[PDB]
Design a protein around this ligand. Structure first.
Ligand code: CHL
Ligand code: CHL
Ligand code: CHL
Ligand code: CLA
Ligand code: CLA
Ligand code: CLA
Ligand code: CLA
Ligand code: CLA
Ligand code: CLA
Ligand SMILES: CC(/C=C/C=C(C)/C=C/[C@@]12O[C@]1(C)C[C@@H](O)CC2(C)C)=C\C=C\C=C(C)\C=C\C=C(C)\C=C\[C@@]12O[C@]1(C)C[C@@H](O)CC2(C)C
Lengths: 217, 212, 213, 230
């Protein structure tokens, strides 16, 4: 029974067989946000969407950042790319965002109705014959079907392992983005530039000496 | 739980049970227990062959061309460092060659993967249906037309062991090329000549301390 | 029966002599509750063990200063080490709390749930963190020589020796602070002065401890 | 029943005379734990065997090569192999030898086989006393020889420590220091060059230089615990 803190008392609601079926369950819930079984089902979906969104976004800040330093690309800092892109753009940011909310809202709305009634989007005739493939799988938050082109979710032996990798990289990615935001205000430089500075002189270039994080010292 | 009769990377050491000598080069080396899960170890078995076989070709393709140049043999590609072959100008641009490379490799690799997923299912020529590989081949060892000289009909177990030993050494050598080239800044055979010129004062300890 | 801090006074009920260094000294009944007594037993040992390291370190460096080897006084070492070695104090402080925080959190949850740190969670170590008693980790990491796994009679004798040298060290560390505040000199600087003229050089004549003097 | 370090005393329970050189000396009870004694048994032999070779070498160096000070032999010696060339061979060769000896201590009888040559093998033996190739010739009874080995070995371990402190204080070799003692035995004892009493403390000066320049680098050379010298 792996736990975030050995010797601590795991919350009872996280030890139930339903709770232990969740990937990445290390008994971490000190504030008791998941005590209600109905709430935990909703928060699990929130983590998956935050996990997957964070991984896509971090990959879009980090991989372009390294290649930019390597000289294979020329991409501005993630906190400047918004301004640079909108200049040589076919639309203003107001129009671009409004479309984004229609498309994301429509797609998100279908996902929302599946949380309320799992498998309800396979209603015959609701879509133009495509509703059959929108039923999802038996596990909420793992749609599969058209979202799994290579069919990696059809191997029962590897299923639990895959879900653990996703949540682990997802949680790490979520913290990475929080680090990008905190390191922009703290240091006023890019993520890869901050890493370069730390590696040069680790013992003098860190948050303990940035003059922000520890105001008392 | 591993028997003591089998060769051991560290004599007198307990070794994992799942490394029971079935695979070639099974010396029980797995301090991190990476291959504990049989499904994963099934994948890692093929990855070692693929990384090894390419490494053997790559190392052969980095030493022999340089060895010929020193001997004086003259060809237009002579005198080009293994890490400068990319910059060299050929009959076609690098991009066009790269595009052809992926299209050709996409066919063969997916063909190889299909056998791994379902062994024996990719042993037939799509066009000339008469052609076919022997039905007894296992993943990673196609045989048939891939073994024209019939060497696999002899002591196969010894040959598999010899392949993986040479392959593992080749993989280490290539990592040496990257480390040495990135540090020394010269070709591999040049480093060997420097070491032979003065073996005692040319260790990596001497070389790296001087830099920092 | 057993000796007590105040001869003639019966020892408290909650102090039965089982613990090491028990002289029935608890005038304020701070450890009357059995569970709170476990917490303080370990608090005393940690305080005592640190004081022994502190006292030995202060004494040794003071000998280096008097002999002229160039060591600074214990009350100036911190400033000298940082400046001479060019160390960022806030970074050194943070590193200390990561290492102390990890090590000392493990000791915290072993007290709450004994044996919990020996479940193999930490790098697979399953027996070096099990613990022998309250405040006595044991094991082949904290007790490599196995002096707690040999003779049982002598191990109990050492527990008596550990606590009493720990209490003595704790008093000494208070002496270093009080003497520095009153005198402004190093530990062995005070000792040398006393040996010179013990009658006319002591706390009763420093002009501070006894203001009415 | 057997001679003891302090005649008339009772040896500790965990000491019973089974091991060679077992004279019942263990005031701190470091050998009480069975496993700890097994490890400490190995280290005593290794320490003693190294000391005997080291002590013999220092004496022979002074006789053969009086000019060179064994203390300064580290920097004085010059060889084509260079500083780091010598260290490289020493590290790899010692790493192999020590690991194999270490493995036998953990799991005896597992590293007796010769890796390269199959036919050759080490006969069964006790931990710390390899046989076969290591012991081509035995003058007499092993039991007597083992006692002789440790008693000479224990003396050698003290002898080497004597060289270091004599070298650091007198700044001379072992034989050279002895000749000084014979010249003026009364004025050369450690009592006759150091003394501490209430109010005064006199200690000998460290005669080894504070730092040593060796091929462009500075090697610290501190006297051992010079601050606590008498
Ligand atoms: C096993 C795989 C593999 C490895 C380890 C390398 C390793 C290397 N290639 Mg090579 N390549 C590999 C496969 C391939 N390469 C190429 C085509 C090239 C080219 C065209 C070049 C390299 C170069 C390089 C070096 C990059 C570091 C450097 O000096 O950057 C600094 C880069 C430069 C100074 C080059 C600047 C001009 C260049 C025209 C800009 C564009 C470069 C491309 C983005 C390179 C893309 C390579 C990718 C696909 C592996 C390095 C030695 C470069 C080299 O040899 O530099 C001396 C180089 O120019 N490779 C192809 C296509 C057939 C490959 C296909 O698999
Ligand atoms: C949900 C998040 C989460 C949180 C809040 C914690 C919180 C904690 N865990 Mg952790 N864990 C968490 C998830 C998990 N833990 C574990 C498994 C464990 C174990 C096994 C243990 C802890 C322990 C601890 C405690 C460490 C206290 C301390 O001072 O650390 C100080 C922190 C450090 C020393 C490490 C971080 C240092 C620094 C921030 C990063 C430096 C990185 C550089 C590469 C450094 C390089 C330096 C070199 C080159 C010189 C702390 C309460 C320990 C404890 O106290 O147990 C009782 C403990 O033993 N956790 C797992 C795996 C199942 C988790 C999975 O999500
Ligand atoms: C048993 C080992 C051993 C001992 C007891 C000595 C003892 C001595 N050497 Mg010698 N040496 C030894 C091995 C070696 N020395 C040298 C090279 C030198 C030089 C060049 C010099 C000495 C000097 C000295 C003297 C002063 C030492 C001092 O203050 O160091 C202070 C402490 C240090 C400098 C570092 C201490 C290191 C630590 C104890 C062990 C480190 C372990 C490694 C990290 C592990 C990896 C290595 C492998 C081999 C295990 C002293 C008499 C000096 C002298 O002559 O003074 C008058 C001097 O200049 N030695 C080599 C060749 C590489 C050795 C190889 O084994
Ligand atoms: C949450 C995910 C996310 C988001 C919101 C963004 C947002 C942005 N990215 Mg980033 N990016 C991401 C993930 C993301 N990226 C990932 C995972 C990668 C790969 C590592 C990249 C690699 C990348 C590059 C290399 C560049 C951007 C750029 C951009 C800008 C939009 C460019 C545009 O107009 O596209 C409009 C077009 C589309 C939205 C349609 C998709 C078109 C592509 C080519 C399809 C590729 C298909 C693929 C080969 C299969 C904007 C700041 C550009 C920028 O910063 O410009 C200043 C830029 O140069 N991104
Ligand atoms: C992993 C395998 C591998 C790879 C990717 C390469 C890749 C390359 N080799 Mg190398 N080579 C290899 C193995 C490999 N070699 C082996 C096993 C040998 C036998 C010793 C050689 C012998 C060799 C020579 C002699 C030369 C190259 C050269 C080249 C370059 C041009 C290839 C070409 O157009 O060939 C021709 C195309 C076909 C045969 C089809 C290219 C960077 C040339 C080079 O670097 O020139 C500057 C060159 O002169 N290779
Ligand atoms: C295939 C293995 C192999 C071989 C035969 C060599 C050979 C050589 N290397 Mg290279 N090297 C290797 C792997 C290898 N290397 C790897 C994997 C790396 C990456 C870490 C490096 C990184 C490296 C550097 C940075 C330097 C060398 C250098 C050297 C030279 C020896 C002096 C030295 O400092 O060595 C250090 C090398 C090692 C300690 C190798 C350790 C790893 C290998 C796999 C150990 C194999 C041991 C095994 C018993 C087999 C021995 C060889 C076999 C043919 C009998 C010599 C030309 C130096 C040079 O060029 O001097 C002029 C130098 O500066 N090597
Ligand atoms: C918890 C107790 C404690 C603490 C907080 C300190 C703290 C200090 N000691 Mg002290 N010391 C202690 C116990 C302690 N000592 C003990 C028990 C002894 C043995 C009796 C010594 C012997 C000692 C010496 C000989 C020296 C110090 C020195 C130092 C300073 C630098 C330490 C350093 O760089 O370590 C880094 C060490 C490591 C990373 C390896 C462990 C620092 C003020 C140094 C000093 O004051 O220099 C001016 C110094 O030379 N200490
Ligand atoms: C712990 C053992 C030890 C160590 C570390 C040293 C170290 C040293 N000795 Mg000393 N020596 C020792 C023992 C030791 N000696 C013993 C036992 C003797 C008596 C036989 C001598 C006799 C001696 C003399 C006469 C001289 C030295 C000298 C030296 C110095 C230079 C060595 C050299 O150039 O070798 C170069 C190496 C060779 C030419 C090849 C040596 C091959 C040997 C014999 C192999 C032995 C293998 C065997 C298994 C070892 C078993 C014992 C071991 C496990 C301890 C150096 C400081 C020289 C000096 O004073 O320099 C200033 C010097 O002239 N030594
Ligand atoms: C290379 C740096 C260095 C230097 C120049 C010194 C210098 C000194 N040390 Mg220190 N010391 C060091 C590193 C160093 N030490 C380290 C790394 C340790 C931890 C192993 C110690 C542990 C230590 C102790 C415990 C004592 C000294 C003492 C001393 C003083 C007398 C010499 C002595 O007995 O050393 C002994 C040093 C060693 C055995 C290790 C040397 C490693 C190189 C002298 C000022 C003594 C003193 O007078 O303290 C007040 C003393 O008691 N040192
Ligand atoms: C979604 C996300 C990030 C998304 C990022 C995106 C899309 C970025 C996009 C872009 O960058 C690109 C690619 C390129 C740029 O040019 C443009 C932008 C547009 C900027 C992060 C979430 C990040 C989310 C984070 C950090 C959440 C952390 C939550 C924590 C720690 C909660 C802890 C606990 O709640 C538990 C679990 C249990 C309780 O009992 C106890 C407590 C402690 C309360």
């Amino acid at each position: 029974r792996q736990s975030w803190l050995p010797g601590s008392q795991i919350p009872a609601h996280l030890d139930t067989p339903a709770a232990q079926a969740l990937a990445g369950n290390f008994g971490f819930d000190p504030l008791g946000l998941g005590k209600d079984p109905v709430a935990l089902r909703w928060y699990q979906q929130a983590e998956l969407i935050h996990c997957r969104t964070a991984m896509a976004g971090v990959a879009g800040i980090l991989i372009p950042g390294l290649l930019t330093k390597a000289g294979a690309l020329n991409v501005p800092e993630w906190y400047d790319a918004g301004k640079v892109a909108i200049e040589n753009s076919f639309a203003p940011w107001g129009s671009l965002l409004a479309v984004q909310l229609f498309l994301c809202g429509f797609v998100e709305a279908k996902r929302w109705q599946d949380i309320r009634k799992p498998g309800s989007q396979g209603e015959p005739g609701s879509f133009l014959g495509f509703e059959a493939s929108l039923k999802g799988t038996s596990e909420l938050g793992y749609p599969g079907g058209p979202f799994d082109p290579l069919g990696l979710s059809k191997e029962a032996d590897k299923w639990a392992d895959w879900k653990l990798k996703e949540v682990k990289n997802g949680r790490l990615a979520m913290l990475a983005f929080l680090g990008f935001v905190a390191q922009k205000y703290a240091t006023g430089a890019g993520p890869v530039d901050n890493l370069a500075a730390h590696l040069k002189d680790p013992w003098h270039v860190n948050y303990a000496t940035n003059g922000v994080s520890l105001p008392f010292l | 739980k591993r028997d003591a009769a089998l060769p051991s990377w560290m004599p007198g050491a307990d070794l994992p049970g799942y490394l029971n000598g079935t695979l070639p080069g099974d010396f029980g080396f797995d301090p991190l227990y990476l291959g504990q899960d049989p499904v994963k170890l099934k994948w890692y078995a093929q990855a070692e062959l693929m990384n090894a076989r390419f490494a053997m070709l790559a190392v052969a393709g980095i030493l022999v061309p340089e060895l010929l140049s020193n001997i004086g043999f003259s060809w237009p590609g002579a005198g080009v460092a293994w890490y400068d072959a990319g910059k060299f100008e050929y009959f076609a641009p690098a991009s066009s060659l790269f595009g052809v490379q992926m299209l050709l490799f996409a066919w063969v690799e997916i063909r190889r993967y299909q056998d791994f997923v379902k062994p024996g299912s990719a042993n037939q020529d799509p066009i000339f249906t008469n052609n076919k590989l022997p039905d007894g081949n296992e993943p990673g060892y196609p045989g048939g037309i891939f073994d024209p000289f019939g060497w696999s009909k002899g002591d196969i177990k010894s040959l598999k062991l010899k392949e993986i030993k040479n392959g593992r050494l080749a993989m280490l050598a290539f990592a040496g090329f990257i480390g040495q080239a990135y540090t020394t800044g010269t070709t591999p055979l040049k480093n060997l000549s420097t070491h032979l010129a003065d073996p005692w004062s040319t260790t990596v300890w001497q070389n790296d301390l001087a830099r920092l | 029966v057993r000796p007590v801090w105040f001869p003639g006074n019966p020892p408290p009920a909650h102090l039965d002599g089982s613990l090491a260094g028990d002289y029935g000294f608890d005038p304020l009944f701070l450890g009357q509750e059995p569970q709170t007594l476990k917490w303080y037993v370990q608090a005393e040992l940690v305080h005592g063990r640190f004081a022994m390291l502190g006292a030995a370190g202060i004494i040794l460096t003071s000998i280096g200063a008097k002999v002229g080897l160039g060591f600074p006084e214990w009350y100036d070492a911190g400033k000298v080490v940082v400046e001479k070695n060019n160390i960022d104090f806030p970074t050194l402080m943070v590193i200390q709390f990561y290492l102390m925080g990890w090590a000392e959190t493990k000791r915290w949850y072993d007290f709450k749930n004994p044996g919990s740190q020996a479940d193999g969670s930490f790098l697979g170590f399953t027996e070096e963190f099990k613990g022998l008693e309250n405040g006595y980790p044991g094991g082949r990491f904290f007790d490599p020589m196995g002096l707690s796994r040999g003779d049982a009679a002598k191990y109990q004798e050492y527990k008596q020796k550990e606590v009493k040298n720990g209490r003595l060290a704790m008093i000494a560390c208070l002496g270093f602070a009080a003497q520095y505040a009153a005198t402004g000199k190093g530990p062995l600087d005070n000792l040398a002065d006393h040996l010179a003229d013990p009658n006319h050089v002591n706390f009763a004549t420093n002009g501070v401890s006894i203001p009415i003097a | 029943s057997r001679p003891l370090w302090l005649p008339g005393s009772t040896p500790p329970a965990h000491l019973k005379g089974d091991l060679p050189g077992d004279f019942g000396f263990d005031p701190l009870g470091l050998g009480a734990n069975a496993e700890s004694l097994k490890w400490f048994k190995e280290s005593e032999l290794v320490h003693s065997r190294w000391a005997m070779a080291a002590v013999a070498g220092i004496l022979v160096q002074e006789i053969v090569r009086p000019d060179v000070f064994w203390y300064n032999a580290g920097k004085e010696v010059e060889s084509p192999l260079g500083p780091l060339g010598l260290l490289a061979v020493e590290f790899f060769l010692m790493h192999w030898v020590e690991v194999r000896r270490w493995q036998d201590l953990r799991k005896p009888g597992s590293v007796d086989q010769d890796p390269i040559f199959s036919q050759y093998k080490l006969p069964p033996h006790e931990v710390g006393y390899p046989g076969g190739v290591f012991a081509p010739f035995i003058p007499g009874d092993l039991a007597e020889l083992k006692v002789k080995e440790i008693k000479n070995g224990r003396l050698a371990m003290l002898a080497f420590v004597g060289f270091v402190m004599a070298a650091q204080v007198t700044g001379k070799g072992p034989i050279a220091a002895l000749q000084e003692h014979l010249a003026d035995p009364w004025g050369t004892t450690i009592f006759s060059k150091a003394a501490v009493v209430p109010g005064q403390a006199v200690a000998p000066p460290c005669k080894i230089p504070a730092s040593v320049s060796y091929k462009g680098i500075e090697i610290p050379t501190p006297c051992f615990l010079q601050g606590l010298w008498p």
